[PDB]
Amino acid sequence: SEESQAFQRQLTALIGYDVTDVSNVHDDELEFTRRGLVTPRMAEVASRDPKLYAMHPWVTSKPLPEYLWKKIANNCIFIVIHRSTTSQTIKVSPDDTPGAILQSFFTKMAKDFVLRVCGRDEYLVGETPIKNFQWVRHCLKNGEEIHVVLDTPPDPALDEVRKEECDRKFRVKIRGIDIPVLPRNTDLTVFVEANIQHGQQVLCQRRTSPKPFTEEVLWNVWLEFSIKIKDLPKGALLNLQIYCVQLLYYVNLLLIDHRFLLRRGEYVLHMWQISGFNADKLTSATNPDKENSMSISILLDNYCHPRAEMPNQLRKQLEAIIATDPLNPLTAEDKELLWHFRYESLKHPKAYPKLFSSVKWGQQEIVAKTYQLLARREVWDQSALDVGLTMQLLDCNFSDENVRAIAVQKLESLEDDDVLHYLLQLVQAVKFEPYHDSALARFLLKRGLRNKRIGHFLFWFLRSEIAQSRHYQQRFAVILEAYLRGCGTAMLHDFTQQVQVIEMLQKVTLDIKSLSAEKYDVSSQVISQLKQKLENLQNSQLPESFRVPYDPGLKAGALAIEKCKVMASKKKPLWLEFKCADPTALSNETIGIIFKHGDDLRQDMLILQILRIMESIWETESLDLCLLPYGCISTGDKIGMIEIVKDATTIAKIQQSTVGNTGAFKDEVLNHWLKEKSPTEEKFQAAVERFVYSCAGYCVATFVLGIGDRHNDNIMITETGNLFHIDFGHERVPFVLTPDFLFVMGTSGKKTSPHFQKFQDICVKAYLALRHHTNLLIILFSMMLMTGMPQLTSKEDIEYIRDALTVGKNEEDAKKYFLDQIEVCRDKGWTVQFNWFLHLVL
Numbered sequence: 001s002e003e004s005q006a007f008q009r010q011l012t013a014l015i016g017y018d019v020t021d022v023s024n025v026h027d028d029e030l031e032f033t034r035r036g037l038v039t040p041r042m043a044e045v046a047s048r049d050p051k052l053y054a055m056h057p058w059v060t061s062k063p064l065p066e067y068l069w070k071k072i073a074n075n076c077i078f079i080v081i082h083r084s085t086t087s088q089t090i091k092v093s094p095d096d097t098p099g100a101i102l103q104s105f106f107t108k109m110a111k112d113f114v115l116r117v118c119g120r121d122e123y124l125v126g127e128t129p130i131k132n133f134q135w136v137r138h139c140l141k142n143g144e145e146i147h148v149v150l151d152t153p154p155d156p157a158l159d160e161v162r163k164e165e166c167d168r169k170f171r172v173k174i175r176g177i178d179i180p181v182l183p184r185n186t187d188l189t190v191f192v193e194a195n196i197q198h199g200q201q202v203l204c205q206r207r208t209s210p211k212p213f214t215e216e217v218l219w220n221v222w223l224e225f226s227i228k229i230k231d232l233p234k235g236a237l238l239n240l241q242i243y244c245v246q247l248l249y250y251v252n253l254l255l256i257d258h259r260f261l262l263r264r265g266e267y268v269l270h271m272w273q274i275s276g277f278n279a280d281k282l283t284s285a286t287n288p289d290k291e292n293s294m295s296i297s298i299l300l301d302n303y304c305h306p307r308a309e310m311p312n313q314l315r316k317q318l319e320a321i322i323a324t325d326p327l328n329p330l331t332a333e334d335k336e337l338l339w340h341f342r343y344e345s346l347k348h349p350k351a352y353p354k355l356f357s358s359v360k361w362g363q364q365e366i367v368a369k370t371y372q373l374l375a376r377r378e379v380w381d382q383s384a385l386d387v388g389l390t391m392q393l394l395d396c397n398f399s400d401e402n403v404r405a406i407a408v409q410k411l412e413s414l415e416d417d418d419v420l421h422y423l424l425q426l427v428q429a430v431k432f433e434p435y436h437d438s439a440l441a442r443f444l445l446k447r448g449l450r451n452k453r454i455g456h457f458l459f460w461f462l463r464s465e466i467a468q469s470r471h472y473q474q475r476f477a478v479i480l481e482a483y484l485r486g487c488g489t490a491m492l493h494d495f496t497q498q499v500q501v502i503e504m505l506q507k508v509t510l511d512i513k514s515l516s517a518e519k520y521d522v523s524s525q526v527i528s529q530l531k532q533k534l535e536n537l538q539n540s541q542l543p544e545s546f547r548v549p550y551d552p553g554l555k556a557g558a559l560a561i562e563k564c565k566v567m568a569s570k571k572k573p574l575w576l577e578f579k580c581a582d583p584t585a586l587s588n589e590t591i592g593i594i595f596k597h598g599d600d601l602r603q604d605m606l607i608l609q610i611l612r613i614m615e616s617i618w619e620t621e622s623l624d625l626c627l628l629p630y631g632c633i634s635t636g637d638k639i640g641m642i643e644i645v646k647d648a649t650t651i652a653k654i655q656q657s658t659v660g661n662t663g664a665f666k667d668e669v670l671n672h673w674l675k676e677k678s679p680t681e682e683k684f685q686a687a688v689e690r691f692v693y694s695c696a697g698y699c700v701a702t703f704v705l706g707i708g709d710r711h712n713d714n715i716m717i718t719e720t721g722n723l724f725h726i727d728f729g730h731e732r733v734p735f736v737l738t739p740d741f742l743f744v745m746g747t748s749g750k751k752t753s754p755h756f757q758k759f760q761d762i763c764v765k766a767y768l769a770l771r772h773h774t775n776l777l778i779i780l781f782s783m784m785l786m787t788g789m790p791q792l793t794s795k796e797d798i799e800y801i802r803d804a805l806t807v808g809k810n811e812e813d814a815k816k817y818f819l820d821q822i823e824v825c826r827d828k829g830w831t832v833q834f835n836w837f838l839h840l841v842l
């Protein structure tokens with residue numbers, strides 16, 4: 001067909017990769033996954049409610065924080081319904097369903113339709129109380145009034161989907177290695193290390209005789225392994241690595257294919273290089289660059305087609321191992337204890353990661369026994385979903401189909417609200433899967449196709465990696481295509497517009513970087529070029545309206561060249577302001593987006609996502625630490641978009657303003673900046689209240705994630721007291737609590753005050769609230785470093801969180817430690833702040 005071909009070119013433009021390309025492949029796994037993904041796609045597409053899908057209500061089943069009821073001692077929530085110019089308020093109960101609200105409006109004024117939010121593409125529909133809608137909850141947290149325009153429901157016909165159409169020991173021959181260009185260092189020797197890895201664990205290791213590092217190094221060696229072919233587990237990788245000792249290149253080949261067949265034949269594998277552990281080292285993908293990359297020649301001539309009662313102190317020994325942290329290492333003694341008493345271990349869902357890692361995957365008998373254990377699941381299936389525990393089974397330590405599936409089975413219970421909270425880390429967890437088609441990938445696909453909101457972010461998260469990861473672009477592309485093949489023409493159209501706008505704006509940011517590279521000033525010659533480039537695009541290129549990638553509810557239209565500016569950073573970022581495409585928008589505020597090139601925004605995406613997970617933990621204990629986890633999406637190679645937080649200034653800009661500059665910092669400026677920016681002394685005290693909470697929040701979050709020690713330049717504050725850290729792109733103070741912050745808190749030097757007692761109290765509640773979910777945080781942290789950052793210590797770097805979360809210690813010793821930390825920041829004052837300035841000169 002020709003319309004099947006024209007649509008495939010549309011999918012390729014959306015993906016940023018061609019899924020039909022067979023040039024960097026040595027098997028049909030990517031094709032076989034494309035076919036494989038049709039069934040779960042169509043099933044979900046066939047199962048969806050067209051009314052609800054088109055309207056995507058963003059709802060929750062979580063209670064409603066104490067701290068949010070205090071906004072209603074009246075049991076009355078006010079909603080203002082709009083038509084053309086007419087607007088009328090309605091007295092609503094928190095449990096009032098939107099259905100009851102429509103026949104309370106039509107009743108009141110008597111002498112089919114849907115409630116859409118003013119300015120946004122969000123709707124208040126379905127069988128849920130208005131207290132249970134995320135937008136209403138935002139209006140309550142922000143003191144805002146619920147403006148809702150009464151209009152016709154969107155046509156579910158717009159969301160239409162276009163119809164688709166042997167006991168022999170294992171051995172590998174290392175023929176040789178070839179690189180077209182060698183010139184670098186001296187002439188150090190080179191050998192090939194062949195590892196049978198499964199769940200990051202090395203089952204068997206075999207090296208070659210060291211030979212001279214030339215442009216072609218032939219060995220013609222058969223590497224005999226101890227492992228038998230029947231004993232090889234599905235999901236095992238032949239990990240081929242090159243050492244000079246030091247590691248230069250790696251490549252992995254899956255010993256067993258997607259059709260359970262044993263890999264047999266001749267392979268010329270183009271290898272990835274290391275810079276002079278992480279998710280990239282696990283990839284089955286080969287380096288697409290055949291011209292510059294190192295390759296390995298290999299040959300596979302391997303054929304095939306494959307009660308009692310626990311003692312008191314042993315039960316206690318087992319329970320002590322099960323109680324331990326995820327980062328706690330297991331002894332051969334602990335493993336034998338977990339395994340021998342596996343049926344007792346099975347009774348504890350929290351023992352699962354330790355138990356499933358305790359398995360000897362290199363033994364066909366043991367794996368069958370493990371498969372026998374998972375059949376008696378019962379205690380697992382009945383356990384309350386523990387995402388922390390579930391995510392733990394989806395990391396690098398688990399390379400088994402069955403173990404990984406039981407964890408995915410647990411994620412199904414999640415409401416759309418919680419899926420959004422973990423989506424990024426769940427997509428990032430696909431990197432850990434041995435195979436392209438997996439339960440996790442099908443889970444993500446299913447969930448994305450069922451909710452537009454999840455589907456939007458799924459697109460962008462998949463796109464973020466397909467554009468920057470040579471290691472996983474193929475796999476993510478195959479899943480993106482699957483998603484795009486069932487999301488609907490409505491969404492395919494919005495995505496088309498978003499991609500076009502972002503591609504255009506990316507060009508401008510790069511072109512503007514050329515004009516003044518690292519010299520900081522921003523000449524009117526550059527300001528004119530940006531202004532011309534913007535008006536030149538607006539005229540006949542940029543579409544009339546695009547969906548905001550970091551906030552799909554907001555639709556952005558026309559630019560505002562007058563507010564658009566290039567900025568003073570060494571990397572020249574674009575500050576772009578837009579008119580809200582929506583005519584029913586209650587305000588006149590623009591949509592602000594910071595298009596920037598320079599840093600890897602993928603790390604920032606991950607940091608912001610944990611920040612939202614900490615906010616939700618805090619909600620479970622009725623704490624609101626007023627964080628601002630701003631919109632941030634990585635669009636391509638070291639390029640992306642940041643959300644512009646309205647009425648905000650940098651902490652350094654405020655100190656700078658009253659002159660002094662050269663390391664000079666006055667403790668009073670922040671307080672005067674707040675008083676000056678607040679029209680009434682109520683607005684001022686509310687801002688000090690906002691500062692106390694936001695400050696405590698960033699202090700805890702920051703310290704826990706190890707991104708505490710920051711420059712003034714990188715901490716911002718709103719005109720309304722709300723503090724927030726920015727740019728998490730890559731003496732020591734645990735966090736930023738400087739004398740200027742402490743002065744807003746009242747306190748002057750080594751003293752005490754009512755607002756500081758409050759601040760100290762909120763830190764302890766917040767820190768303890770985090771510690772209640774130690775394992776959750778430990779796993780996300782670990783995952784974030786493996787899938788987002790460069791090279792990382794499979795202990796050191798990761799163990800930071802454990803030490804920072806003060807694992808093992810009681811609630812009193814933990815509170816002391818955090819209050820000690822606060823004092824370190826007090827003692828040093830401006831020491832570190834001035835120290836950054838000093839480093840510019842010395």
Ligand SMILES: Cc1nc(N)nc2c1cc(-c1cn[nH]c1)c(=O)n2C1CCCC1
Binds near residue numbers: 646
């Ligand atoms: C969220 C936000 N709001 C405002 N309103 N200005 C910001 C930011 C964030 C960042 C940011 C950069 N990298 N990562 C984040 C930022 O630089 N800014 C400003 C633009 C120039 C300096 C201050």
